[PDB]
Design a protein around this ligand. Structure first.
Ligand SMILES: *[C@@H]1O[C@H](CO)[C@@H](O[C@@H]2O[C@H](CO)[C@@H](O)[C@H](O)[C@H]2NC(C)=O)[C@H](O)[C@H]1NC(C)=O
Ligand SMILES: *[C@@H]1O[C@H](CO)[C@@H](O[C@@H]2O[C@H](CO)[C@@H](O)[C@H](O)[C@H]2NC(C)=O)[C@H](O)[C@H]1NC(C)=O
Ligand SMILES: *[C@@H]1O[C@H](CO)[C@@H](O[C@@H]2O[C@H](CO)[C@@H](O)[C@H](O)[C@H]2NC(C)=O)[C@H](O)[C@H]1NC(C)=O
Ligand SMILES: *[C@@H]1O[C@H](CO)[C@@H](O[C@@H]2O[C@H](CO)[C@@H](O)[C@H](O)[C@H]2NC(C)=O)[C@H](O)[C@H]1NC(C)=O
Ligand SMILES: *[C@@H]1O[C@H](CO)[C@@H](O[C@@H]2O[C@H](CO)[C@@H](O)[C@H](O)[C@H]2NC(C)=O)[C@H](O)[C@H]1NC(C)=O
Ligand SMILES: *[C@@H]1O[C@H](CO)[C@@H](O[C@@H]2O[C@H](CO)[C@@H](O)[C@H](O)[C@H]2NC(C)=O)[C@H](O)[C@H]1NC(C)=O
Ligand SMILES: *[C@@H]1O[C@H](CO)[C@@H](O)[C@H](O)[C@H]1NC(C)=O
Ligand SMILES: *[C@@H]1O[C@H](CO)[C@@H](O)[C@H](O)[C@H]1NC(C)=O
Ligand SMILES: *[C@@H]1O[C@H](CO)[C@@H](O)[C@H](O)[C@H]1NC(C)=O
Ligand SMILES: *[C@@H]1O[C@H](CO)[C@@H](O)[C@H](O)[C@H]1NC(C)=O
Ligand SMILES: *[C@@H]1O[C@H](CO)[C@@H](O)[C@H](O)[C@H]1NC(C)=O
Ligand SMILES: *[C@@H]1O[C@H](CO)[C@@H](O)[C@H](O)[C@H]1NC(C)=O
Ligand SMILES: *[C@@H]1O[C@H](CO)[C@@H](O)[C@H](O)[C@H]1NC(C)=O
Ligand SMILES: *[C@@H]1O[C@H](CO)[C@@H](O)[C@H](O)[C@H]1NC(C)=O
Ligand SMILES: *[C@@H]1O[C@H](CO)[C@@H](O)[C@H](O)[C@H]1NC(C)=O
Ligand SMILES: *[C@@H]1O[C@H](CO)[C@@H](O)[C@H](O)[C@H]1NC(C)=O
Ligand SMILES: *[C@@H]1O[C@H](CO)[C@@H](O)[C@H](O)[C@H]1NC(C)=O
Ligand SMILES: *[C@@H]1O[C@H](CO)[C@@H](O)[C@H](O)[C@H]1NC(C)=O
Lengths: 960, 269, 50
């Protein structure tokens, strides 16, 4: 029978406490929702390690026998438990598969109501048990609840395990090597887990290293179509090459006149050579000898001669000597093997072996010869030599290793070997005009991109097996655990299901409704979670709107919202410096001296990061210090209704304001942070100085010293600075104060409700923490060294090899620290652009009023109040936004005495029965007068001009 | 993705993860650039059926419904601008959806003045809107309307000269073909660096693995990984600093889209 | 486990099998003494630019 694991069988991987923070790990784990086998004893396989459980109430199950053989034939482990005691044995057991129960030597060891649960494995010779006890009330299923298993056995017994049997219902499942995420709680207990390789949700949770993951798209891994089969292709030649002649020839050459034989048109089993004891050396120079049999060769040449033992060592690339200067010589990037053997019985008697460019030969002469008696010493003896020089695969293939060959199955993804060109790809027919001598062709990447098939001599195109990323669409773990996958770019034929132009979408449901985007997918596709399922659709670009345009239709706004469109800017990184030698070397002597070989890098890194550190003080100061004095607030707060009480300092508070404190709350070695030159208290005084100036004196404290002005008189400037003529403040004064005060209310609620409000700074704090964590984690990276713990090199290797490994680890850490400093520099450009942008907003948009449309927040702009925040700033941009409107009829001008009048400021409009001038951005309909308007020329040149009457303000004075 | 290599690339730590993340960062930064430039509009303002914008002929720059539904001048532009582990991920706003979004920005900029940056799109006749432009250069709007038919012919003629300039001269798109060429040069350089030996015995990794045992191949493959990784970091670092020029250009464009499109700017030149 | 630091006896409850604890990223933040089983928080030895 079969049953559900749910999440059971997780165990503590490491003896490491962590406080309420999440660990990503890789081990033999029981997979989530795996089919657990149920039992009611039999012998079983052990596989990649075991999860086991017994439901218990009367103490029936008493442990196991494990092993390769699960009983005393060979590698075997009696493992018995009786409450608080455990007994273990290895030397051959007296009993069979179990003892009776109540109703040459080496080793041994000693140490329903409830569920007893266990995990069993061996790693590095250490056999493990991890274990748990819990109460229960059910026999017939495992609990849908989580509790990790804790280590009790950890013994370097070295016995492998592949079988086991139980001693005594019970449950079994088999572990798999998997990445997992673990929820170590505030007390260092594991309280939840994720099998990352369960499903798209669990791949997202491990990508974020988080038990909750937000609504979004996540590049969880990469997908490749796997090879369906292996194709092996060689020219169909059954001839066997004459190595049995060449290596056995009656006489070899005298080296000055060294022999060359071309070898061709055959199979050649080089393992016959390599496996032979006949060869004293068999050095190889562009191949390893196991691999020779997997290759086919465009030409092969046996260069051959006999030479003396003192000179056999000359027969290699880079060499010189009596042979290697003139008698016989190799290219220094030769490909081949050099094969030689002591041949006293095959050359001594004798003196016939005479001696004197790459593969040059000459016979002109008084030339020397080797003396070879059978009495010669080992270096004095004759040795027979072959150089198997190999041509290369840039040409027709000719001599092959002894492989099988196969059918030529196209359009499948396959592994392919052609003539020893290995690879993986989709093979097809091709239109390519190969010339009669060419064997294969190449991409700009130098990789093969077409091949002649060596059996038919037809031309094949080779294409990559279809591939792309595995982007995952999760609705947010809050709202669902239903998830969908975009396989990027790939057609669905290779993979509910749907096809996007951005690739193949699985588990999502296609929808025809033009909904807004919520999670982006690609190529115009977005998803949302709706009545439920993950729908995916062509997004609407927001709602559609046929604007009610005409040559005479105008929508003057009758009303506004004042609003507090929060805009949030990073203004520093987190000021860092690095002790280059504590980072690279931990101040350890040998490494500290090896870093001197590199010269100025430590210094220009310190100079770069000191440049960064000063730039951050300079950013913070060029943003906030835009006023030469702390201006300070009055005791009274008579601001004509405008209630700054949450944005001004709390005198009982550091002396932050309340909204600065909400912001400061919601935002959350060799390396050192260096404190900002302005402390968080100084920053708060300076943002208070800016703000208190911006309240009591407005823009003027940017120019001179602060000139005080009543706050209801400052807004009457800012209203003129959006072309909203200033009585539109006063004739709504308390209603505007209420809109501002209420909006400031909504800011406290908005910031209290979500970290998505505090986006950019909470992102930058995470980028800094991520970069610094990456730089710290990189201290644990190997970069190809034997260790990432530097002392574990220095305590373990001979000093030459230690310097080799440490020079690699330094090169790694230094490249990583340069990568980090380059990241910090590139990010410091991103942050400095933000800081100069912030400084510009503070210059134009605080100490003034920017006319730059949609530069301040998102409206017509009045003023903004800066608020400090960690490594950044928040601007409460008090943007005016018009928010009710009417349809009205308009004209660019209006006639009177054939003269055309035009509006001095604002625009002409009618409600349908009367004509008015109105200011551009609020419906203040005014009777049209000479005071509102200016004459030009005559009507006839203007398209869309209308007749009217215009009021002359002198007429009552003429009438009176 | 050869296993004999990828186990060695994992020894180089968070380099490979942070490069995937840096390029994913760049890719999301492009969709961001594209939304922060173009998505400054919350509703697709749709063009009116009749087109009586005083005389300013936008038919070259508005979409043609017969066609992706681009404008005529966008088709001039799309004509004039021109796999080994590399990828291109499509723009979330497709070249089609961008034709609609730019048609919305433009349809707002025609039908609704600068208002659609601040409020809802409040319609205003295009002749009326140019008075709200001439006053923004300190020219009284009588100098617009007493020249209305002339300015129409001047704008239409200038749009003539733009189609001619673009159709004649590919180097009118200098910066775009330069950026496309820069990415193409960077990619083809990155690809040619797949072939560069770096002092390993081969240009091609599969040859090394066809030829060598995995105790010696380690050394050759480590040189090739080191060289390729250095070339990939060099590529990504150039792409990040290039992305800083692109993103400065994107925020500059977003600013010109805020101030030069969704508004006007008194910033001379 | 080795290093240089300032050792302070500390209130943290390690589990009966936990020998060590770690910070946000790898750093071995605390240890159990393998003689009297109390927990010591390992502060870094002070360093800084002159
Ligand atoms: C090809 O010609 C060169 C001379 O141009 C030969 O070099 C001489 O080799 C003899 C060998 O006994 C030396 O004693 C001479 O001193 C060499 N002369 C120079 C200038 O180096 C060369 O040996 C010839 N090639 C081969 C393969 O023998
Ligand atoms: C402009 O809009 C505001 C709301 O944004 C209107 O204020 C409301 O006025 C009515 C009485 O007329 C009150 O019942 C509401 O409680 C007010 N709301 C708020 C938030 O104060 C305002 O009256 C409108 N002005 C005009 C001239 O139409
Ligand atoms: C300004 O706003 C603050 C709250 O932001 C007001 O504080 C309230 O004051 C009254 C009288 O002391 C208390 O009953 C409330 O409980 C306070 N509310 C809070 C949230 O603390 C303050 O009265 C307002 N002042 C003006 C002049 O508008
Ligand atoms: C257009 O606006 C004008 C002024 O608000 C309105 O004209 C007044 O209408 C009332 C009756 O509702 C008359 O008693 C006044 O004598 C009118 N004023 C003048 C100066 O003549 C007009 O009614 C509005 N029309 C519409 C369609 O809203
Ligand atoms: C504005 O009113 C004048 C009359 O006050 C209109 O002028 C007439 O226009 C027609 C067509 O051009 C001529 O046949 C008449 O002879 C004109 N009359 C006079 C007295 O000149 C003018 O068309 C009106 N314009 C608008 C836009 O309403
Ligand atoms: C607006 O511009 C379009 C071109 O975009 C003009 O359409 C051309 O009109 C001429 C005749 O005037 C035809 O011969 C062409 O074939 C048209 N070209 C295209 C591409 O359609 C249109 O006439 C202009 N309208 C106005 C009012 O200026
Ligand atoms: C194995 O598990 C899957 C769900 O993961 C289930 O559909 C299948 O029926 C199970 N098979 C057995 C034999 O329990
Ligand atoms: C467990 O059994 C062993 C012998 O197998 C015995 O020596 C030990 O005292 C027993 N302990 C308990 C707790 O039963
Ligand atoms: C023990 O091993 C030796 C060889 O090492 C062998 O001669 C002997 O017969 C073995 N005896 C037993 C009881 O295993
Ligand atoms: C375990 O397996 C290895 C081969 O993987 C073998 O060499 C070793 O002898 C085995 N262990 C024992 C106890 O025989
Ligand atoms: C940690 O364990 C103690 C008891 O040992 C308990 O009082 C405390 O509540 C636990 N911590 C948390 C975060 O619950
Ligand atoms: C090799 O293939 C050809 C056909 O392509 C065939 O004529 C020939 O007989 C084959 N070789 C052998 C040894 O049969
Ligand atoms: C040399 O000849 C012997 C038989 O005399 C043969 O066994 C051997 O394999 C030959 N050498 C090679 C390289 O095949
Ligand atoms: C997250 O949970 C809260 C309740 O705790 C809920 O109000 C909120 O809407 C959820 N998030 C989303 C994106 O729905
Ligand atoms: C998907 O692949 C099939 C062939 O397997 C092809 O007929 C179809 O046109 C492809 N579709 C797309 C959108 O590429
Ligand atoms: C979407 O609409 C098309 C017609 O426009 C229709 O053929 C198709 O079945 C619809 N699909 C769904 C899921 O509604
Ligand atoms: C304006 O009026 C027209 C009818 O004259 C109507 O179709 C349109 O929807 C109205 N627009 C607004 C913004 O009220
Ligand atoms: C406005 O539009 C209407 C309908 O298209 C047209 O009759 C009228 O002549 C136009 N007037 C102006 C001033 O463009």
């Amino acid at each position: 029978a079969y049953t559900n694991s749910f999440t059971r069988g997780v165990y503590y991987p490491d003896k490491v406490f962590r406080s309420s923070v999440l660990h990503s790990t890789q081990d033999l784990f029981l997979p989530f929702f795996s089919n657990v086998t149920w039992f009611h004893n039999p012998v079983l396989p052990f596989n990649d390690g075991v999860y086991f459980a017994s439901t218990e109430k009367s103490n029936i199950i008493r442990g196991w026998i494990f092993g390769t053989t699960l009983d005393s034939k060979t590698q075997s482990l009696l493992i018995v438990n009786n409450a608080t005691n455990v007994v273990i044995k290895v030397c051959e057991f007296q009993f069979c598969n179990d003892p009776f129960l109540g109703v040459n030597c080496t080793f041994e060891y000693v140490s329903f109501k409830n569920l007893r649960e266990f995990v069993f494995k061996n790693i590095d010779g250490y056999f493990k048990i991890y274990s748990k006890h819990t109460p229960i009330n059910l026999v017939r299923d495992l609990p849908q609840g989580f509790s990790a298993l804790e280590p009790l056995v950890d013994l370097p017994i070295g016995i492998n395990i592949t079988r086991f049997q139980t001693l005594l219902a019970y449950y079994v499942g088999y572990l798999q090597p998997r990445t997992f995420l673990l929820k170590y709680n505030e007390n260092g207990t594991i309280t939840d887990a994720v099998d990352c390789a369960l499903d798209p949700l669990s791949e997202t949770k491990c990508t974020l290293k988080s038990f909750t993951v937000e609504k979004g798209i996540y590049q969880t891994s990469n997908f490749r179509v796997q090879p369906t089969e292996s194709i092996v292709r060689f020219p169909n030649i059954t001839n066997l090459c004459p190595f049995g002649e060449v290596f056995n020839a009656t006489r070899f050459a005298s080296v000055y006149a060294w022999n060359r034989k071309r070898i061709s048109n055959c199979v050649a089993d080089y393992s016959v050579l390599y496996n032979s004891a006949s060869f004293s050396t068999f050095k190889c120079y562009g191949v390893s000898p196991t691999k020779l049999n997997d290759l086919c060769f465009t030409n092969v040449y046996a260069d051959s001669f006999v030479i003396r033992g003192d000179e056999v060592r000359q027969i290699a690339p880079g060499q010189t000597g009596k042979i290697a200067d003139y008698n016989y010589k190799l290219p220094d990037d030769f490909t081949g093997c050099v094969i030689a053997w002591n041949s006293n019985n095959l050359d001594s008697k004798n003196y016939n072996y005479l001696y004197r460019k790459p593969f040059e030969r000459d016979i002109s002469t008084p030339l020397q010869s080797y003396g070879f008696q059978p009495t010669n010493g080992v270096g004095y003896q004759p040795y027979r030599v072959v150089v198997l020089s190999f041509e290369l695969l840039h040409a027709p293939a000719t001599v092959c290793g002894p492989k099988k060959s196969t059918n030529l199955v196209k359009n499948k993804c396959v592994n392919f070997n052609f003539n020893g060109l290995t690879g993986t790809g989709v093979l097809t027919e091709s239109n390519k005009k190969f010339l009669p001598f060419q064997q294969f062709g190449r991409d700009i990447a130098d990789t093969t991109d077409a091949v002649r098939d060596p059996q038919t001599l037809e031309i094949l195109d080779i294409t990559p097996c279809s591939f792309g990323g595995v982007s995952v669409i999760t609705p947010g773990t809050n709202t669902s655990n239903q998830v969908a996958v975009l396989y990027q770019g790939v057609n669905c034929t290779e993979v509910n299901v749907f096809q996007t132009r951005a690739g193949c979408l699985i588990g999502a449901e296609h929808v025809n409704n033009s909904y807004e985007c919520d999670i982006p997918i690609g190529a115009g596709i977005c998803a949302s979670y709706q009545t439920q399922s993950i729908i995916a659709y062509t997004m609407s670009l927001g709602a559609e709107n046929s604007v009610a345009y005409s040559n005479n239709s105008i929508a003057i706004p009758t009303n506004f919202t004042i609003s507090v469109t929060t805009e949030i800017l990073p203004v520093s990184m987190t000021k860092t410096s690095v002790d280059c030698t504590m980072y690279i070397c931990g101040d350890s002597t040998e490494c500290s001296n090896l870093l001197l070989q590199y010269g100025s890098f430590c210094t220009q890194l310190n100079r770069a990061l000191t440049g960064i550190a000063v730039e951050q003080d300079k950013n913070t100061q060029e943003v906030f210090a835009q006023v030469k004095q702390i201006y300070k607030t009055p005791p009274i707060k008579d601001f004509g209704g405008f209630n700054f009480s949450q944005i001004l300092p709390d005198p009982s508070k550091s002396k932050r304001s309340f909204i600065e404190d909400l912001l400061f709350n919601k935002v959350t070695n060799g390396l050192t942070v260096l404190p900002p030159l302005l402390t968080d208290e100084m920053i708060a005084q300076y943002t208070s100085a800016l703000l208190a100036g911006t309240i009591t004196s407005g823009w003027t404290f940017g120019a001179g010293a602060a000139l005080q002005i009543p706050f209801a008189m400052q807004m009457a400037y800012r209203f003129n600075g959006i072309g909203v003529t200033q009585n539109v403040l006063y004739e709504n004064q308390k209603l505007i104060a209420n809109q501002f005060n209420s909006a400031i209310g909504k800011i406290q609620d908005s910031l209290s409700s979500t970290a998505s409000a505090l986006g950019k700074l909470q992102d930058v704090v995470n980028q800094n923490a991520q970069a610094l964590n990456t730089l710290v984690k990189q201290l644990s990276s190997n970069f190809g060294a034997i260790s990432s713990v530097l002392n574990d090199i220095l305590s373990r290797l001979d000093k030459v090899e230690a310097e080799v490994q440490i020079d690699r680890l330094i090169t790694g850490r230094l490249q990583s620290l340069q990568t980090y400093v380059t990241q910090q520099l590139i990010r410091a450009a991103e942050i400095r652009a933000s800081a100069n942008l912030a400084a510009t907003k503070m210059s134009e948009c605080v100490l003034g009023q920017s006319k730059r449309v949609d530069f301040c927040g998102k409206g017509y702009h009045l003023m903004s109040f800066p608020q400090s925040a960690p490594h950044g700033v928040v601007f409460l941009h008090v943007t005016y936004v018009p928010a009710q409107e009417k349809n009205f009829t308009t004209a660019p001008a209006i006639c009177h005495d054939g003269k055309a009048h035009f509006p001095r400021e604002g625009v002409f409009v009618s409600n349908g029965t009367h004509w008015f001038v109105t200011q551009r951005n609020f419906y203040e309909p005014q009777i049209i007068t000479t005071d509102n308007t200016f004459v030009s020329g005559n009507c006839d040149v203007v398209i869309g001009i209308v007749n009217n009457t215009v009021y002359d303000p002198l007429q009552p004075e003429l009438d009176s | 993705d050869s296993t004999e290599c990828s186990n060695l690339l994992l020894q180089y730590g968070s380099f490979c993860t942070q490069l995937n993340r840096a390029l994913t960062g760049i890719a999301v930064e492009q969709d961001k650039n594209t939304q922060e430039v173009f998505a400054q509009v919350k509703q697709i303002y749709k063009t009116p059926p009749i087109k009586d914008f005083g005389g300013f002929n936008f038919s070259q720059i508005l979409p043609d419904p017969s066609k992706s539904k681009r404008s005529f001048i966008e088709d001039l532009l799309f004509n004039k601008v021109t796999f080994n582990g590399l990828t291109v991920l499509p723009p979330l706003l497709t070249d089609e959806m961008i034709a609609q979004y730019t048609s919305a920005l433009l349809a707002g900029t025609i039908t609704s003045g600068w208002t659609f940056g601040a409020g809802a799109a409040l319609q205003i006749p295009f002749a009326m809107q140019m008075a709200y432009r001439f006053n923004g250069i300190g020219v009284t709007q009588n100098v617009l309307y007493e020249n209305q038919k002339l300015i129409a012919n001047q704008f239409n003629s200038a749009i003539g000269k733009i189609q001619d300039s673009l159709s004649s001269t590919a180097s009118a798109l200098g910066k775009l073909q330069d950026v496309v060429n820069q990415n193409a040069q960077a990619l083809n350089t990155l690809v040619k660096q797949l072939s560069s030996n770096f002092g390993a015995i081969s240009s091609v990794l599969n040859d090394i693995l066809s030829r060598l045992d995995k105790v010696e191949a380690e050394v050759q493959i480590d040189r090739l990984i080191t060289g390729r990784l250095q070339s990939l970091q060099t590529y990504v670092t150039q792409q990040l600093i290039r992305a800083a020029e692109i993103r400065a250009s994107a925020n500059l464009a977003a600013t010109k889209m805020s101030e030069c499109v969704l508004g006007q700017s008194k910033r001379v030149d």
